[PDB]
């Protein structure tokens, strides 16, 4: 019957119009937290270099490339 197909179309339209939350906030917060942790990991070596009295060129960082540019 036609009314059943129309109800199916209405259900499809209802499902297609679901409210999508702003997922950008989630990913942005996760990336910022990861960059925070990665940059804070260097505080140990920086503090040891400063307290040892070494220069900028003589301070060896164990830094590895991060897929996030930070």
């Amino acid at each position: 019957t036609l009314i059943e197909l129309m109800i199916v179309v209405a259900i499809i339209g209802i499902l297609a119009a679901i409210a999508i939350p702003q997922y950008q906030n989630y990913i942005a917060k996760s990336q910022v937290s990861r960059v925070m942790s990665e940059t804070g990991s260097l505080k140990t070596v920086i503090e040891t270099c400063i307290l040892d009295g070494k220069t900028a060129a003589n301070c060896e960082l164990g830094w590895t490339n991060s897929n996030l540019l930070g």
Binding site: K29, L42, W63, L69
Partner: protein, 69 residues
């Protein structure tokens, strides 16, 4: 690599040369980061007394609780 020069363009180190300067570890987003935060920065600052703090220029809703100042 070293504090004077690092192997990544997005990471910079401001190394103190005297007892009155402050150290800084700055990282600029990009590459695989989100487009919205593509060119923002997150920095760790160390005062000459030896106190570490975090700051960032990203929007407020993206900041974690640690770097909310």
């Amino acid at each position: 690599s070293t504090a004077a020069v690092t192997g990544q363009t997005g990471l910079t180190i401001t190394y103190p040369a005297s007892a009155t300067e402050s150290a800084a570890i700055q990282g600029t987003f990009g590459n695989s980061a989100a487009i919205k935060i593509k060119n923002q920065t997150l920095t760790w600052t160390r005062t000459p007394e030896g106190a570490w703090s975090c700051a960032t220029t990203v929007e407020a809703k993206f900041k974690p609780a640690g770097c909310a100042s």
